[PDB]
Symmetry: C4
Amino acid sequence: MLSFLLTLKRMLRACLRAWKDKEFQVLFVLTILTLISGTIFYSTVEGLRPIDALYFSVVTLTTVGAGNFSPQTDFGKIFTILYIFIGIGLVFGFIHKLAVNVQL
Amino acid sequence: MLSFLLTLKRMLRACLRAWKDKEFQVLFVLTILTLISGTIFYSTVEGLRPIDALYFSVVTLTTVGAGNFSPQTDFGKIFTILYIFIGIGLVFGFIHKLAVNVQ
Amino acid sequence: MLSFLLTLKRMLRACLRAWKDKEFQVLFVLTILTLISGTIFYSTVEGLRPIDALYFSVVTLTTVGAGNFSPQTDFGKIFTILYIFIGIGLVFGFIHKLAVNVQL
Amino acid sequence: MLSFLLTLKRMLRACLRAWKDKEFQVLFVLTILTLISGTIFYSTVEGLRPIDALYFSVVTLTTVGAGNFSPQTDFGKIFTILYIFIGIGLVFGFIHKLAVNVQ
Ligand SMILES: [Ca+2]
Ligand SMILES: [Ca+2]
Ligand code: NA
């Protein structure tokens, strides 16, 4: 049990340690900006309550997927399609970073 | 084919070997803890039967996604959002771990 | 355009070449067995037409997710939860293989 | 912060650099071709407007998942199933590619 905690502590440090990487920071800021753009878009174009626009934005950008909603307008559909690829682009970026920070 | 069977057994042994690595154990415990928390939260805050709270927690944390449910309360929606990133954080941890052992 | 085709051809060979790896073969067979078990389970326990049981099995094991269905019985729910982790276990296996076959 | 901006620009350049690699171009073309095929198929076989066929094709091939649609015909269901594995095959290709450049 003491090993668990010491490993947990080491791992948690490593995580916070990665929060120092400028590229990880960019990816993160880029992700927040994307989630905000999405929240603004869906509430405006699809007329969703801000909290619902962020929710759809989140489950969409992470590939989780929404269980009861899909854009009703053609503008929203087109946007969601491009939105998804930005999300995949961001995920690839994070993964590439990992792959790089593991091989040095 | 003994060959297929031997290759499988070799793979299963490599898998059990993983369940011995401390960092994997932490990640595993953390996800179980995260699933339990989710079950508790959705049962209480969204009024779901525990079994359905576990289900939603699972399909959500894994990015599988729910086919019919979506949080009705604002607290639930905000929790689900942070819950998803915890899941992503956990997945990256397992991935990083698999990229570490591959050396 | 000729480069495209020659690269496409080289890549396609590499893919088929990977179909020779015994571990990839096991993962694959393991995946087919899992999809068949799932198809059998959902058609039996949830009463879904075989083709619908395979569909739900597929979108569930790949994390795609079903847009209009979720198990109705507690037995189905429990099964789906374990089913998902088997799927993640298989994906990790494939990924681990990649990571290994790239570093040699 | 010039620093943030410089780091970003550096990353964007690395991304554009990728769009120059032939294997990436093949994978990219293949996915676009796969998306077009999907749009065509679902419009024709499931009677969806092209825009909705593209949407379903996209959320399906990316594992995002559709919130309200699911194929009504057997041909559609079988196609979706193979479509998903094409998507997984493509993702593994991009992943393998990103694990190759990381050396
Ligand atoms: Ca999904
Ligand atoms: Ca739905
Ligand atoms: Na997913």
